[model samples]
Target: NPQDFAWQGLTLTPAAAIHIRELVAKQPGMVGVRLGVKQTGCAGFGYVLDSVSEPDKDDLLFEHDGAKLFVPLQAMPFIDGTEVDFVREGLNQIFKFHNPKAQNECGCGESFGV
Candidate 1:
């Protein structure tokens, strides 16, 4: 059966926004964080994040609770309806992605199949 993918755009949870605000506070010139996809790992697509000092012209900006998320337009198709969050894993804190388009992931947890 053929069906259309529900595109909700990108979003950041409250925890994610708070964490991002902290990051921006520490970096003098950073305006926000950038979310993108890289071509690596066995599953083909991997998520990548970088501090955004200067946003790209092709970037689409999403803001939540005063925290800004810049995403490249080209990468949106692969990551639409994704919820980004900051999680505390024991003593380490990390950014996590809950992506609807990510149907499968490698056993090693390095990348996801879209």
Candidate 2:
């Protein structure tokens, strides 16, 4: 269904905002983070995060917690209703995605096949 492909474009949880604030603090030169999909992974697409030293001119920006999130104009549709979250599992603290549109994801959740 087309519902699997959607975004306007994303939101961060309170924990996510807190963690993102921390990440921004650790990297002084970074503008913020960029969230988007890349054409790789076991599935046809993969989610990604990159520290934005500089943003692309075409980036569609979303701001929260005093940090910026740059979304590529063409990449919005596939990520609608995605909530970025932070979790601590054992010794590792990681970013997680709750994507409502995901029909299937790898066992490790390294990739999603929608």
Candidate 3:
């Protein structure tokens, strides 16, 4: 079954949507976004992003804002209640992860083991 998720508080900002739109438009063969956690860095787990052209036979799919996001079955538990957003600060701008399951993150923010 496909679980429905909502983006409250601050949804993906215009800038963030533009970024995903650009990637989708540019990658003619791309079908969706793949988000997962990998073992790396000092925090033990780091996030991974990939432009997926198709979903594997066992992949779980989630849709939001007309964009399909894919996650491995193993990662569903850790990221189930997370929200993704884009933020701007002074001369910096980037995608941010608002993951409720995160218990702690390293100082660099490059990764979160949770």
Candidate 4:
């Protein structure tokens, strides 16, 4: 089933939203962020991110913090309540996924097992 995820009271942090805006501007043809899942190494599943020129036939579109996200229909179920965030740790910076559905994840955090 397809579901819609809203970011009503949640807003992206300044730096993160700025980075996303820059990325969108760099690719004017891109309509939004394309989110999906893929198999990596021996893991069960891994999240995938891409700049989308347009939404797919069955994509679930979400808008937040002056940005847009297009999630593939198949991936929506697993990511319904998930919140995507950008985290900075000392000298390291990366995007993180806080998903309620995730049961286990690899040490490297590249993939998760349901």
> How high is each candidate's TM-score?
0.81, 0.75, 0.67, 0.69
Give per-residue CA lDDT, model 3, range 19-94, as digits (tens).
6677798889887677778878585666676789878875767665666667776666556666665565676666
Q: How well does candidate 4 match the true structure in TM-score terms?
A: 0.69
Which residue pairs collide, candidate 2? 6-77, 6-80, 7-80
lDDT of each: 0.82, 0.73, 0.64, 0.65
TM-score of decoy 2 = 0.75
Task: State in Å the error of residue 23, model 1.
Answer: 0.7
Between prediction 3 and prediction 4, the one with superior TM-score is: 4
Question: What are the per-residue Cα lDDT tens digits for candidate 2 across 3-83?
Answer: 334345777777778777888888888877788888984667777877888899877677777767787766677776677
Task: List all candidate RMSDs to the true structure.
Answer: 5.6, 5.5, 5.9, 5.4
Ranking of all candidate structures by their lDDT, best first: 1, 2, 4, 3
In model 1, the runs with Cα more than 4 Å from the true position are 1-7, 105-114
Which tens-of-lDDT digit does each residue in 1-114 have in candidate 1? 322344467899999999899989988999999999999848678788889988998787899999999988778787877888887656667888888756663356663322
Specify the poorest-scoring 10-residue window by lDDT in model 3.
2-11
Worst 10 residues of 4 by lDDT: 2-11
lDDT of 3: 0.64
